[PDB]
Protein backbone atom coordinates (compact mmCIF):
# COMPACT_ATOMS: atom_id res chain seq x y z
CA UNK A 1 0.00 0.00 0.00
CA UNK A 2 0.63 3.63 -0.47
CA UNK A 3 0.29 5.86 2.26
CA UNK A 4 -2.49 8.76 2.14
CA UNK A 5 -2.41 12.39 3.05
CA UNK A 6 -5.67 12.83 5.13
CA UNK A 7 -4.50 12.98 8.32
CA UNK A 8 -0.99 12.99 9.81
CA UNK A 9 0.76 9.42 11.14
CA UNK A 10 1.47 9.42 14.83
CA UNK A 11 3.18 7.05 16.89
CA UNK A 12 2.01 6.52 20.49
CA UNK A 13 4.61 7.06 22.94
CA UNK A 14 5.31 3.75 25.20
CA UNK A 15 8.62 3.33 27.39
CA UNK A 16 10.08 -0.50 28.02
CA UNK A 17 13.00 -1.67 29.82
CA UNK A 18 16.03 -3.70 27.50
CA UNK A 19 18.87 -5.13 29.31
CA UNK A 20 18.59 -2.93 32.45
CA UNK A 21 18.10 0.32 30.58
CA UNK A 22 15.44 2.68 29.46
CA UNK A 23 13.95 2.86 26.34
CA UNK A 24 11.40 5.78 25.17
CA UNK A 25 9.22 3.68 21.85
CA UNK A 26 6.16 3.97 20.56
CA UNK A 27 3.38 1.67 19.13
CA UNK A 28 1.97 1.91 15.61
CA UNK A 29 -1.74 0.65 14.78
CA UNK A 30 -2.03 -2.23 12.18
CA UNK A 31 -3.32 -1.26 8.89
CA UNK A 32 -5.74 -3.43 8.76
CA UNK A 33 -7.51 -1.15 11.60
CA UNK A 34 -6.79 1.93 8.94
CA UNK A 35 -8.83 3.83 6.80
CA UNK A 36 -8.39 2.72 2.46
CA UNK A 37 -9.47 5.39 0.57
CA UNK A 38 -8.84 6.47 -2.81
CA UNK A 39 -5.72 8.51 -3.76
CA UNK A 40 -7.66 11.39 -5.83
CA UNK A 41 -10.14 12.16 -3.33
CA UNK A 42 -11.65 10.86 0.23
CA UNK A 43 -13.71 7.63 -1.62
CA UNK A 44 -13.47 4.02 0.52
CA UNK A 45 -11.46 2.02 -1.14
CA UNK A 46 -12.61 -0.84 1.16
CA UNK A 47 -16.24 0.35 2.64
CA UNK A 48 -18.08 -2.18 4.83
CA UNK A 49 -16.52 -5.08 4.27
CA UNK A 50 -15.98 -5.30 0.21
CA UNK A 51 -13.93 -3.15 -2.45
CA UNK A 52 -15.08 -0.94 -4.18
CA UNK A 53 -15.45 -2.22 -8.08
CA UNK A 54 -14.97 0.30 -9.91
CA UNK A 55 -11.48 1.58 -7.81
CA UNK A 56 -11.09 -2.24 -7.38
CA UNK A 57 -11.76 -4.13 -10.35
CA UNK A 58 -8.49 -6.33 -9.75
CA UNK A 59 -5.33 -6.33 -7.19
CA UNK A 60 -3.47 -4.74 -9.49
CA UNK A 61 -5.73 -1.62 -9.79
CA UNK A 62 -6.79 -1.23 -6.62
CA UNK A 63 -3.45 -1.13 -5.22
CA UNK A 64 -2.29 1.83 -7.85
CA UNK A 65 -5.38 3.46 -6.81
CA UNK A 66 -5.56 3.11 -3.15
CA UNK A 67 -4.04 4.48 0.03
CA UNK A 68 -3.95 3.79 4.08
CA UNK A 69 -4.06 7.14 5.96
CA UNK A 70 -2.69 8.01 9.50
CA UNK A 71 -3.66 8.01 12.84
CA UNK A 72 -2.63 11.36 14.69
CA UNK A 73 -2.38 12.18 18.17
CA UNK A 74 -6.12 12.43 18.76
CA UNK A 75 -7.21 9.41 16.64
CA UNK A 76 -5.67 6.78 19.51
CA UNK A 77 -8.07 7.97 22.12
CA UNK A 78 -11.01 9.02 20.00
CA UNK A 79 -11.14 6.52 17.41
CA UNK A 80 -9.54 3.76 19.27
CA UNK A 81 -10.05 3.91 22.98
CA UNK A 82 -6.21 3.68 23.23
CA UNK A 83 -3.94 5.46 26.18
CA UNK A 84 -0.61 5.53 27.08
CA UNK A 85 1.25 6.80 29.62
CA UNK A 86 4.91 5.55 30.77
CA UNK A 87 5.56 2.13 30.31
CA UNK A 88 1.82 1.32 30.48
CA UNK A 89 -0.65 0.72 27.28
CA UNK A 90 -4.08 0.58 27.62
CA UNK A 91 -6.66 -1.21 24.55
CA UNK A 92 -10.41 -0.77 24.42
CA UNK A 93 -12.91 -3.26 22.93
CA UNK A 94 -15.94 -0.60 21.43
CA UNK A 95 -14.90 2.30 20.84
CA UNK A 96 -18.22 4.61 19.34
CA UNK A 97 -17.13 7.90 17.42
CA UNK A 98 -19.86 10.01 16.04
CA UNK A 99 -19.58 8.35 12.32
CA UNK A 100 -18.10 5.03 12.84
CA UNK A 101 -17.74 2.25 15.66
CA UNK A 102 -13.85 0.88 16.36
CA UNK A 103 -14.09 -3.17 17.63
CA UNK A 104 -10.29 -3.76 19.05
CA UNK A 105 -7.16 -2.98 17.97
CA UNK A 106 -3.69 -4.39 17.15
CA UNK A 107 -0.83 -2.84 17.52
CA UNK A 108 3.13 -3.12 17.15
CA UNK A 109 6.20 -1.84 19.07
CA UNK A 110 8.48 0.17 17.02
CA UNK A 111 12.34 0.67 17.15
CA UNK A 112 12.04 4.09 15.39
CA UNK A 113 9.08 5.77 12.73
CA UNK A 114 10.37 3.45 10.39
CA UNK A 115 10.84 -0.05 11.52
CA UNK A 116 9.24 -2.06 14.39
CA UNK A 117 11.60 -3.35 16.87
CA UNK A 118 12.93 -6.86 16.90
CA UNK A 119 13.08 -9.02 19.94
CA UNK A 120 15.90 -11.98 19.75
CA UNK A 121 14.24 -13.96 22.48
CA UNK A 122 16.77 -16.71 22.64
CA UNK A 123 18.16 -17.26 25.82
CA UNK A 124 16.46 -14.13 27.48
CA UNK A 125 13.64 -13.22 29.81
CA UNK A 126 11.29 -11.75 28.58
CA UNK A 127 8.35 -9.91 31.34
CA UNK A 128 5.33 -7.48 31.50
CA UNK A 129 2.96 -7.15 33.67
CA UNK A 130 -0.87 -7.17 32.83
CA UNK A 131 -4.14 -5.84 33.91
CA UNK A 132 -6.64 -8.75 32.49
CA UNK A 133 -9.41 -8.25 34.82
CA UNK A 134 -11.88 -6.51 32.56
CA UNK A 135 -11.91 -9.79 29.82
CA UNK A 136 -14.70 -10.89 30.04
CA UNK A 137 -15.55 -14.68 28.25
CA UNK A 138 -14.97 -14.17 24.70
CA UNK A 139 -12.44 -11.72 24.73
CA UNK A 140 -8.98 -12.03 24.05
CA UNK A 141 -6.34 -9.58 25.54
CA UNK A 142 -2.90 -10.77 23.67
CA UNK A 143 0.73 -10.01 23.77
CA UNK A 144 2.41 -12.35 20.76
CA UNK A 145 5.83 -12.14 18.41
CA UNK A 146 5.21 -12.72 15.03
CA UNK A 147 8.15 -13.22 12.62
CA UNK A 148 7.31 -9.98 10.33
CA UNK A 149 9.77 -8.10 8.30
CA UNK A 150 11.73 -4.89 10.28
CA UNK A 151 10.24 -2.51 7.89
CA UNK A 152 6.83 -3.87 6.92
CA UNK A 153 7.56 -4.72 3.79
CA UNK A 154 8.67 -1.59 2.25
CA UNK A 155 12.37 -3.10 1.02
CA UNK A 156 11.20 -6.40 -0.38
CA UNK A 157 7.64 -5.03 -2.11
CA UNK A 158 7.68 -1.95 -4.41
CA UNK A 159 4.34 -0.98 -4.21
CA UNK A 160 4.76 -1.23 -0.19
CA UNK A 161 5.22 2.50 0.33
CA UNK A 162 3.54 3.09 3.62
CA UNK A 163 5.79 0.38 5.55
CA UNK A 164 6.08 0.17 9.28
CA UNK A 165 5.50 3.16 9.62
CA UNK A 166 1.73 2.52 8.66
CA UNK A 167 1.51 -0.80 10.25
CA UNK A 168 1.87 -2.56 7.28
CA UNK A 169 3.20 -6.22 6.88
CA UNK A 170 1.04 -8.34 9.48
CA UNK A 171 1.32 -11.78 9.06
CA UNK A 172 0.56 -14.74 11.83
CA UNK A 173 0.44 -18.95 12.07
CA UNK A 174 -2.87 -18.66 10.90
CA UNK A 175 -2.35 -17.43 7.53
CA UNK A 176 -4.98 -14.81 7.63
CA UNK A 177 -7.14 -13.73 5.03
CA UNK A 178 -8.08 -11.09 6.16
CA UNK A 179 -5.44 -9.10 5.97
CA UNK A 180 -6.44 -6.36 3.32
CA UNK A 181 -2.70 -6.09 2.27
CA UNK A 182 -0.34 -8.91 1.74
CA UNK A 183 3.29 -8.19 -0.09
CA UNK A 184 2.48 -4.75 -0.87
CA UNK A 185 -0.43 -5.86 -2.75
CA UNK A 186 -4.25 -5.16 -2.27
CA UNK A 187 -5.52 -8.23 -1.31
CA UNK A 188 -9.15 -7.67 -3.27
CA UNK A 189 -8.82 -10.58 -5.85
CA UNK A 190 -11.80 -13.23 -4.81
CA UNK A 191 -12.42 -10.95 -1.40
CA UNK A 192 -16.11 -12.56 0.32
CA UNK A 193 -17.16 -10.47 2.74
CA UNK A 194 -17.94 -12.31 6.54
CA UNK A 195 -21.14 -13.25 7.13
CA UNK A 196 -20.94 -12.42 10.40
CA UNK A 197 -18.40 -9.55 10.71
CA UNK A 198 -19.59 -6.30 9.63
CA UNK A 199 -16.15 -4.75 8.73
CA UNK A 200 -14.22 -8.04 7.71
CA UNK A 201 -13.61 -10.40 4.84
CA UNK A 202 -10.96 -12.84 3.39
CA UNK A 203 -8.77 -12.04 -0.03
CA UNK A 204 -7.10 -14.73 -2.27
CA UNK A 205 -3.72 -14.43 -0.65
CA UNK A 206 -2.78 -15.35 3.37
CA UNK A 207 0.14 -13.95 5.34
CA UNK A 208 1.70 -16.70 6.79
CA UNK A 209 4.72 -16.22 9.54
CA UNK A 210 5.94 -18.18 12.58
CA UNK A 211 4.69 -16.84 15.95
CA UNK A 212 5.16 -16.94 19.60
CA UNK A 213 2.28 -16.11 21.64
CA UNK A 214 3.53 -15.22 25.53
CA UNK A 215 -0.16 -14.39 26.00
CA UNK A 216 -3.37 -15.28 25.27
CA UNK A 217 -6.28 -14.39 28.04
CA UNK A 218 -8.92 -12.94 29.83
CA UNK A 219 -10.10 -12.95 33.04
CA UNK A 220 -11.37 -16.84 33.35
CA UNK A 221 -8.44 -18.98 31.19
CA UNK A 222 -4.79 -17.83 29.57
CA UNK A 223 -2.16 -20.22 27.48
CA UNK A 224 1.14 -19.28 25.94
CA UNK A 225 1.77 -20.89 22.49
CA UNK A 226 4.23 -21.85 20.15
CA UNK A 227 3.68 -21.82 16.07
CA UNK A 228 6.73 -22.93 14.02
CA UNK A 229 6.26 -22.80 10.17
CA UNK A 230 7.98 -24.49 7.45
CA UNK A 231 8.57 -20.98 5.38
CA UNK A 232 10.67 -18.25 6.17
CA UNK A 233 9.86 -15.09 8.02
CA UNK A 234 7.10 -13.14 6.26
CA UNK A 235 5.39 -15.68 3.57
CA UNK A 236 2.87 -14.36 1.72
CA UNK A 237 0.32 -17.59 0.65
CA UNK A 238 -2.68 -18.87 -1.69
CA UNK A 239 -4.42 -22.10 -2.20
CA UNK A 240 -3.44 -25.07 -0.36
CA UNK A 241 -0.45 -23.64 1.03
CA UNK A 242 -2.73 -21.15 3.61
CA UNK A 243 -3.73 -24.11 4.93
CA UNK A 244 -6.93 -22.94 5.60
CA UNK A 245 -9.85 -24.00 8.12
CA UNK A 246 -11.64 -27.24 7.54
CA UNK A 247 -10.06 -30.00 5.21
CA UNK A 248 -6.68 -28.22 4.42
CA UNK A 249 -5.97 -27.32 8.06
CA UNK A 250 -3.30 -29.28 8.39
CA UNK A 251 -1.80 -29.48 4.90
CA UNK A 252 -0.52 -25.90 4.55
CA UNK A 253 3.18 -24.06 5.62
CA UNK A 254 2.16 -23.08 9.44
CA UNK A 255 0.70 -24.94 12.09
CA UNK A 256 -2.34 -23.31 12.73
CA UNK A 257 -3.03 -25.05 16.74
CA UNK A 258 0.80 -24.64 17.57
CA UNK A 259 2.02 -26.42 20.20
CA UNK A 260 0.02 -24.73 23.23
CA UNK A 261 0.70 -24.82 27.31
CA UNK A 262 -3.04 -23.87 28.69
CA UNK A 263 -2.88 -24.31 32.14
CA UNK A 264 -6.40 -25.14 32.53
CA UNK A 265 -6.77 -27.22 29.42
CA UNK A 266 -4.10 -29.50 31.15
CA UNK A 267 -6.03 -29.82 34.33
CA UNK A 268 -5.51 -26.93 36.18
CA UNK A 269 -8.63 -25.65 37.12
CA UNK A 270 -8.25 -23.60 39.92
CA UNK A 271 -4.69 -21.91 39.24
CA UNK A 272 -5.47 -18.57 37.13
CA UNK A 273 -8.99 -16.80 37.33
CA UNK A 274 -11.13 -14.79 39.38
CA UNK A 275 -9.53 -15.90 42.81
CA UNK A 276 -7.45 -18.15 41.20
CA UNK A 277 -3.63 -18.82 42.85
CA UNK A 278 -2.30 -16.32 40.13
CA UNK A 279 -5.75 -14.06 40.36
CA UNK A 280 -7.22 -12.24 37.32
CA UNK A 281 -8.85 -9.59 39.21
CA UNK A 282 -5.99 -7.80 39.73
CA UNK A 283 -2.67 -7.11 37.76
CA UNK A 284 -0.42 -9.90 37.43
CA UNK A 285 3.67 -10.07 35.92
CA UNK A 286 4.38 -12.59 33.10
CA UNK A 287 7.90 -14.03 33.17
CA UNK A 288 8.96 -16.27 30.03
CA UNK A 289 12.48 -17.78 29.79
CA UNK A 290 13.19 -19.24 26.48
CA UNK A 291 16.07 -22.07 27.26
CA UNK A 292 18.46 -23.27 24.90
CA UNK A 293 21.10 -25.97 25.05
CA UNK A 294 23.80 -25.75 22.74
CA UNK A 295 22.61 -22.43 21.76
CA UNK A 296 19.28 -24.01 20.31
CA UNK A 297 16.03 -23.49 22.41
CA UNK A 298 14.85 -26.63 24.44
CA UNK A 299 12.29 -25.08 27.14
CA UNK A 300 9.99 -22.01 27.24
CA UNK A 301 9.41 -21.92 30.96
CA UNK A 302 6.52 -19.44 32.62
CA UNK A 303 6.59 -17.77 36.39
CA UNK A 304 4.24 -15.70 37.72
CA UNK A 305 4.84 -12.77 40.48
CA UNK A 306 1.65 -11.13 41.79
CA UNK A 307 1.88 -8.88 45.45
CA UNK A 308 5.28 -10.02 45.77
CA UNK A 309 4.40 -13.68 45.88
CA UNK A 310 6.41 -15.78 43.18
CA UNK A 311 4.21 -18.91 41.30
CA UNK A 312 5.92 -21.38 39.56
CA UNK A 313 3.55 -22.77 36.51
CA UNK A 314 1.16 -25.14 36.67
CA UNK A 315 2.19 -28.62 35.90
CA UNK A 316 0.06 -30.85 33.79
CA UNK A 317 -2.52 -32.64 35.54
CA UNK A 318 -3.53 -36.04 33.82
CA UNK A 319 -2.01 -38.43 36.66
CA UNK A 320 -1.46 -42.04 35.23
CA UNK A 321 -1.79 -40.30 31.70
CA UNK A 322 0.64 -37.66 30.99
CA UNK A 323 4.03 -36.62 32.68
CA UNK A 324 3.87 -33.16 35.07
CA UNK A 325 5.66 -30.90 32.27
CA UNK A 326 5.79 -27.72 33.79
CA UNK A 327 6.60 -25.51 30.53
CA UNK A 328 6.75 -25.84 26.69
CA UNK A 329 9.71 -28.64 25.35
CA UNK A 330 9.49 -31.06 22.95
CA UNK A 331 8.29 -34.01 24.72
CA UNK A 332 5.51 -32.05 26.58
CA UNK A 333 4.23 -31.27 22.73
CA UNK A 334 4.26 -35.07 21.43
CA UNK A 335 3.20 -36.39 24.85
CA UNK A 336 0.34 -33.69 25.25
CA UNK A 337 -0.84 -34.48 21.08
CA UNK A 338 -1.02 -37.99 21.77
CA UNK A 339 -3.19 -37.42 24.73
CA UNK A 340 -5.35 -34.88 23.33
CA UNK A 341 -5.72 -36.82 20.08
CA UNK A 342 -4.18 -33.70 18.10
CA UNK A 343 -2.16 -33.91 14.87
CA UNK A 344 1.36 -33.16 15.82
CA UNK A 345 1.65 -30.10 13.13
CA UNK A 346 3.77 -28.84 15.16
CA UNK A 347 6.45 -31.18 15.07
CA UNK A 348 5.74 -31.72 10.98
CA UNK A 349 6.86 -27.47 10.40
CA UNK A 350 10.21 -28.57 12.25
CA UNK A 351 9.27 -28.60 16.23
CA UNK A 352 11.34 -27.20 18.91
CA UNK A 353 14.25 -26.86 16.63
CA UNK A 354 12.38 -24.90 13.41
CA UNK A 355 11.23 -22.74 16.23
CA UNK A 356 14.44 -22.06 17.53
CA UNK A 357 15.59 -20.69 14.28
CA UNK A 358 12.37 -18.73 14.12
CA UNK A 359 12.97 -17.46 17.35
CA UNK A 360 17.09 -16.68 16.20
CA UNK A 361 15.99 -14.71 13.26
CA UNK A 362 14.59 -12.20 15.00
CA UNK A 363 10.26 -11.27 15.52
CA UNK A 364 8.05 -8.01 16.13
CA UNK A 365 5.65 -7.39 19.10
CA UNK A 366 2.13 -7.68 18.82
CA UNK A 367 -0.48 -6.80 21.62
CA UNK A 368 -4.12 -6.67 20.38
CA UNK A 369 -7.45 -7.27 22.29
CA UNK A 370 -10.16 -9.02 19.88
CA UNK A 371 -13.43 -10.96 19.93
CA UNK A 372 -13.15 -14.30 17.33
CA UNK A 373 -16.12 -14.57 14.59
CA UNK A 374 -14.57 -17.84 13.73
CA UNK A 375 -14.97 -19.72 17.29
CA UNK A 376 -16.53 -17.10 19.61
CA UNK A 377 -13.41 -18.07 21.82
CA UNK A 378 -14.20 -21.38 23.02
CA UNK A 379 -11.15 -22.92 22.20
CA UNK A 380 -9.26 -20.77 24.80
CA UNK A 381 -12.18 -20.55 27.59
CA UNK A 382 -14.90 -22.79 27.10
CA UNK A 383 -15.14 -26.40 25.94
CA UNK A 384 -14.13 -27.45 22.04
CA UNK A 385 -15.44 -28.51 19.72
CA UNK A 386 -18.18 -27.09 21.79
CA UNK A 387 -19.92 -30.93 22.07
CA UNK A 388 -16.75 -32.86 22.63
CA UNK A 389 -16.38 -34.70 25.79
CA UNK A 390 -12.56 -36.61 25.26
CA UNK A 391 -9.37 -35.52 27.12
CA UNK A 392 -8.24 -31.72 25.90
CA UNK A 393 -11.95 -30.91 24.79
CA UNK A 394 -11.91 -28.79 28.07
CA UNK A 395 -10.89 -25.08 28.00
CA UNK A 396 -12.13 -22.99 30.87
CA UNK A 397 -15.26 -22.74 32.60
CA UNK A 398 -17.03 -20.29 30.13
CA UNK A 399 -20.00 -21.51 28.58
CA UNK A 400 -20.35 -23.21 25.49
CA UNK A 401 -22.75 -20.27 24.53
CA UNK A 402 -20.38 -17.33 25.71
CA UNK A 403 -18.53 -15.24 23.19
CA UNK A 404 -20.79 -14.46 20.57
CA UNK A 405 -19.16 -11.35 19.12
CA UNK A 406 -23.06 -9.43 18.70
CA UNK A 407 -23.38 -10.43 22.31
CA UNK A 408 -20.00 -9.21 24.20
CA UNK A 409 -19.59 -6.43 22.14
CA UNK A 410 -23.75 -5.12 23.01
CA UNK A 411 -23.17 -6.37 26.76
CA UNK A 412 -19.06 -6.08 27.73
CA UNK A 413 -18.58 -2.76 25.17
CA UNK A 414 -16.36 -1.28 27.98
CA UNK A 415 -13.69 -3.79 28.57
CA UNK A 416 -10.16 -3.29 28.30
CA UNK A 417 -6.86 -4.47 28.39
CA UNK A 418 -3.46 -2.85 30.16
CA UNK A 419 0.01 -3.77 29.33
CA UNK A 420 2.64 -2.36 31.06
CA UNK A 421 6.68 -2.63 32.30
CA UNK A 422 7.47 -4.47 28.99
CA UNK A 423 11.20 -6.07 29.80
CA UNK A 424 13.92 -7.94 28.43
CA UNK A 425 17.07 -9.14 29.61
CA UNK A 426 18.97 -12.43 30.75
CA UNK A 427 17.44 -15.27 32.82
CA UNK A 428 16.91 -14.99 36.45
CA UNK A 429 16.02 -17.51 38.75
CA UNK A 430 12.94 -17.87 40.46
CA UNK A 431 12.53 -19.81 44.15
MG1 LIG B 1 -5.78 -5.44 -14.74
MG1 LIG C 1 16.47 -2.99 18.27
MG1 LIG D 1 -6.00 -14.01 -10.30
Given amino acids: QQAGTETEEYHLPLTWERDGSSVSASVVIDSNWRWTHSTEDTTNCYDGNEWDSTLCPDADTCTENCAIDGVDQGTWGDTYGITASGSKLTLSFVTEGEYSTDIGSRVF ?30 LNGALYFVSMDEDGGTSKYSTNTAGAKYGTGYCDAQCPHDMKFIAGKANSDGWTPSDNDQNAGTGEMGACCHEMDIWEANSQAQSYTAHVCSVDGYT ?13 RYKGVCDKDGCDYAAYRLGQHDFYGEGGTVDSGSTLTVITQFITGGGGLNEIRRIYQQGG ?62 DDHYANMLWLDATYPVDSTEPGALRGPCSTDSGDPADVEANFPGSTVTFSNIKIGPIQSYD
Fill in 109 to 138: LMADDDNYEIFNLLDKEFSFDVDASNLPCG
Fill in 236 to 248: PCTGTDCGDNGDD
Fill in 309 to 370: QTIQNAAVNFPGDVDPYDSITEDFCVDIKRYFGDTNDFDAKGGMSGMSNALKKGMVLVMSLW
